[PDB]
Amino acid sequence: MKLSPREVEKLGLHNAGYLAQKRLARGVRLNYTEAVALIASQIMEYARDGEKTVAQLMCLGQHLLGRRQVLPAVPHLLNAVQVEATFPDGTKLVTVHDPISRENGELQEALFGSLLPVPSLDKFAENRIPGEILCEDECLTLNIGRKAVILKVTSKGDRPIQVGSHYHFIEVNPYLTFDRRKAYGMRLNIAAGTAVRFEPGDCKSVTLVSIEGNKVIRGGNAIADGPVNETNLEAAMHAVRSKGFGHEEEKDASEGFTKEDPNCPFNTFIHRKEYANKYGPTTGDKIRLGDTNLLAEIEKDYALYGDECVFGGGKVIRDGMGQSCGHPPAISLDTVITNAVIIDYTGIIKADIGIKDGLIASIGKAGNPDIMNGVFSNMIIGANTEVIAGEGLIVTAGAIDCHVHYICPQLVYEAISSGITTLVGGGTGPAAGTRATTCTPSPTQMRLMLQSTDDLPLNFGFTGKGSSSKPDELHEIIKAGAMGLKLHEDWGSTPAAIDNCLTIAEHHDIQINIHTDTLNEAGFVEHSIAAFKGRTIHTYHSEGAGGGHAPDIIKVCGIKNVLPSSTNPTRPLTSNTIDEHLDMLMVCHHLDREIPEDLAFAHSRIRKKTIAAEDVLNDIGAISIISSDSQAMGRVGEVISRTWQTADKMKAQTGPLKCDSSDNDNFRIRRYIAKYTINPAIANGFSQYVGSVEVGKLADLVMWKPSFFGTKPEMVIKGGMVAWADIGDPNASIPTPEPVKMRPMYGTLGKAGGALSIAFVSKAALDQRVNVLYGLNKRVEAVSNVRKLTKLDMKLNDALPEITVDPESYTVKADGKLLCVSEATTVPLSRNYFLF
Amino acid sequence: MKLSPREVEKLGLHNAGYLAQKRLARGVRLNYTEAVALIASQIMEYARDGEKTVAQLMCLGQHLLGRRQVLPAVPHLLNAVQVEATFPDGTKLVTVHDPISRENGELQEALFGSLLPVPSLDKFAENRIPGEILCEDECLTLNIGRKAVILKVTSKGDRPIQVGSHYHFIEVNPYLTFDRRKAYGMRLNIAAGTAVRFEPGDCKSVTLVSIEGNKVIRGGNAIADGPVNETNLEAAMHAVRSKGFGHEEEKDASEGFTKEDPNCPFNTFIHRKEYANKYGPTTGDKIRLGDTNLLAEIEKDYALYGDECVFGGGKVIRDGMGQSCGHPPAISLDTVITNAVIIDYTGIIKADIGIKDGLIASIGKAGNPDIMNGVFSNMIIGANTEVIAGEGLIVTAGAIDCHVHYICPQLVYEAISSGITTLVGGGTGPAAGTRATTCTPSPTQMRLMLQSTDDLPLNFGFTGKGSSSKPDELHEIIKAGAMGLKLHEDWGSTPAAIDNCLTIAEHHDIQINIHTDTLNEAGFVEHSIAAFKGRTIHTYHSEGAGGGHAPDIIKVCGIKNVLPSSTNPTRPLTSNTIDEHLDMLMVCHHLDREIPEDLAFAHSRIRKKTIAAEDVLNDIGAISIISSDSQAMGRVGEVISRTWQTADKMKAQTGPLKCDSSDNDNFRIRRYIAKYTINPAIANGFSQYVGSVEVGKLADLVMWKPSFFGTKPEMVIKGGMVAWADIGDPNASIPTPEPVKMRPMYGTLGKAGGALSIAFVSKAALDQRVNVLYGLNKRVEAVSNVRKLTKLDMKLNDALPEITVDPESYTVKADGKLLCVSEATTVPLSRNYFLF
Ligand code: NI
Ligand code: NI
Ligand code: NI
Ligand code: NI
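ok -> structure tokens follow
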């Protein structure tokens, strides 16, 4: 066949289309993903037939699926479908604009080439706008507090001339005629990144405003190079005359100032709706998170309206304009993320993000101090600065999953593609020990796992086997590179082992993670708590379905020296949770339903009442961390989604939190994002490096469309370089035609991944330079400051309720009050998004 | 399921087959690729059913598709289909020979297992032979100018004896009896690589000719080891007697000489058709390039007829025969490519290619100087020499794409699989800046991109952001590793930036690439030209759809100091070009068709008249380079195909060029291949390393079947080692059974890719040993000699017409003459080859 990579890929796309066609044929209302697959595949198939033009297929594509054949959200989510195919005249791109335009599609066309029977329209049996922006109906004034002038501008050219918002107006094409003197030090008072067009012979009046900051003109035609002053004005006018740039005095041109005044003729206004469309939302605006019920309100914005950094043709980030000429090369940002909505435990804000040497260098207003006010010296865009366009998007910290079983490499790819940039756990591959426990037991394996993962663009921490009553071997795995230890009942979680392991932790400044004695073999939960002896410990899957003292391990959530986490599969309590978990446990542990003792054990471990309590305890901040339990009892690609599904369920069933305002869900949002960002970093002792969008930390950052927030990110940035991202057909004319998949980027090739990341180890390991011993390219840093932590150090998740669990009925109470929530029948961040 | 890799692969093959079956079921005439998929899948399916033998399926496979169910070219292209499947008696290989043997196929069998309705034969509605060889009807004489003898040879053996063309005849199996004395220093006068068979008791007369060159006998039975002379003859005859090798004097055996004489009984002849079948074509023969209208004539051949280097059982490249024993080990070739048709800007020739230390060591006649005439000391095949079989194939230089946006890694794989071995451009991954511009802005990113790509078997050059009015930052990106700079309107392409960037280039000996001011914001095209100040500059997408002064950027093609390139999507003007491009632009730039100014801009940039002119300007050599614009506005896998589609269109609409002869298209072919080989290398300053099939340069070479020339190569050789190649089922008994895909080879594993390639940097970067600083394994070399270049230095593309563009109508003229060509409704190198 001699198949090229693109032919293999397009076959995959066609297969997805055919799946969507079969589903359509039985009356399934297609989701966004299925709709894209079907429409793109159909365009390819009509191209193969060779009877239809690109123009014809732009039209035909709008007739395939109607509103009745797709889910309610699809007409909102689906703005366009793009694909390239081999026409009789070669490869061409087709864009189908707004494809869901009718009530019912022409289903013979939707099923063309499939040989499937066309279903009657009555087969499709009978709302929320994902990622919607809410704003007040009001306009905003641009460029306030500046000198202004209105000038008549005439084109004497025979070809069109277009001038951008931040172009120095005296520097324009000599075939424009106007008062060049009055234009000196001025620029167009129009929305940032827009332009004014002059056709040959056109006269148009334009409003100009003064440049600000240092007021220095650079670039263009070098007519008026230098600081704005009287001497340089006269020099500029001499150059205008000598070089024949169009100039005519306009003595009576209106002059004034811009201000907060709806009636000022010098002002330019923009409605909040259009502002949000161009730059993303601003202060007071609200954003729906994915298809959840959660609304995030912008708390503050660093932008000065009119000076937004937007990159593109005729736009702001250009030489001498938004791109600075007046600064030392060494202080140029490496990359700027422009116009980001930042969602972080520290706040929900609007800002530019500066990246330098792989670190978050600055958060605030970026640009050029020579023409803009409010640009600090650490936010300068230079010639040597890359641009990532954040407008309309949400940026968060990379997620940190701190309950990883390293069972296979493929879970790493699933993790990063979901928005996780740090993994903490243990394992050696799919050995029984690892399939059961987060343990890398041997120094040999510690070396090999650090070497194995050295080129992967994630930060890694490996934990050894802490289940020993003697310190001797624990010292060895720690000096070999372990940054923590796991106590697991499968290796013995006895009071003797617990005490020894914690004594080791006190010496080594590492965190201990525990899966307790489910069997109550050596003691009940109170006896394990006693063995902690008030020392800091991280309790894994604190609810207990994932393991622990039956039935009351969840009591640890009220213990001050405990840092409690949840694993994912129980998040949140839904219709299928109990049936799924009970069978999973009995299959995994080879338990027989016919044997009374086996069933008794299973029922003692899988409990509706404690899982329901876990929903509430997460919501009130009594559980501090959410994690996967990857391929042992949890799902690596669902750390983020399960967190937001829990928050959504709790809002639906209890309303806003005590500390939330009436207008938004900001407090709940900040509390929940802390669970998979900052708190895993604090618990494990590397919070100075990662875990939040804050200056000085690694630029591990994830870009989200609001409509896909919490499910499928756009782009994963690791140490300031794109590591993974959505990209379409590699042969295509543009990056967006189908099939669009999450794919590894340049941060995954060669040794680039190591340059962008950190392997976290113990101080003991770093003291012996384990990176040198093992020949690692990845930076290594020691974990620290984990032995004086309490629940109070868990950001926004510091609650310590007195927890009681009835030993017979399993009823859970917090401070004497019943902790109960109903099962949810549905969750968001699911059916709208996934192909399977 | 426990799926092995081959099971996953065969599922993919089956899916391709089912796609072909659905298409067949609606009456589609299948292309080559679809036909292979269907036939192979059907053989697998009948194997699964377990009722048919291998022998039965060899027959059944010939009945599936008739001539009416496939495209006209398919019976020509499809010589065999091979696949392996699990029969009841295990894995077996089936080869279906000449599968399109009937007018109509047995379509129930073609659709067996699919459950699809069988279409009536009237559903298939109603020529060029791709890659055909044309030759004169005449024979060629082998081995002329040699002593000859005819000897009776009798077998006294009880088992068969077969003797190859270049075996020293006195050294044959002692159970052959003949005149051993008259056989001394002789070999069979038969086509190179053929053999004569002797069954037990057979007597056959054979014609022998003298060995030539140094006339030294080596190997065999060591009967007659040494130079051919009287002393060694007597020694040989003593050995014949002592060891009992069959000998009988034939006193009256006819003796003479070979010569140019059709009546000489000592001569052996071969028809040009059979010669071409065995060795590829020779001088005067013609080859159709793919399914295009272009005919390449062999201009000269280095072969001496009869001494062709062919490798295989009983063939020429064997110890003491075509494989030399008389030379120092150090001068053995590493690899020989045998019997190649070389297509290069320097000429269309037939030769062997010698490779040593990853370089093209020699081009000419290879072999063994001890038995062949005309073998120079740099073309010796030794024991330590690998063989690549070039007979019947075309070899070209690896393509060089010098307009690459490094948006994702996957475009690199698409590029090499299409026949590209050098990439030049800029980027950091899918950041907005890179999606828009060929720029790697930060020294941090320059380091990371060089490190990221270090193990990939392509040569790379990275360009920084040249859009600055000050030199300071430009110096820094250059010393960091940039081998060029891009001026782009999105960062500002103002006269001030242009002038500064060029001054920097004059100092650093690097090339400047420019995307000009489309908006005419700072000036019209003449003002940008003025800013060049006569200095060398590379104009990207010179026609302007990809960007530039509206509407007349194309004027640069007549400027002496401009080196102009085209990007691909406009190549050539076809029925769908304008509709496709207009919508692409408006989608990408968020332009509204309802807004008059937006539509006016779009129409000013996408112009039928200038794209038509671009066809003609390429044909007359006024545009010198073709490039991709990968994923920004062009297609990385179509640099080569779009070049040949342009040439084909222009031949169809204007006939042969002025400088072309009446009998072939050699001049046009050489002009066009220069556009993606030598000229990108000259423009960017690394032409001493790559860009043509010439001695001393890197052995970056691509092997093509003539029938697939310009679309899908067989094999991509990087620095003398196979990097990518067509390979079938990895579990199969042979390399050819389905699915055959372009796959990465050993040149892509470990650090092999770096050993085979070069990262091109500036002299400034090399002066500081950036390869050492960055820990690169790939060789680094400095670009040079780019600041004194003019259009006259662009090989076979040095035309400087005076170009005018009407500002109102967009009419383009060259030297006062209209430049117009019609739209093409179809292109070659498309529908015959691609699955989608
Ligand atoms: Ni556990
Ligand atoms: Ni676990
Ligand atoms: Ni461009
Ligand atoms: Ni480009």
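The first strand of chain B starts at residue 80 and ends at 87.
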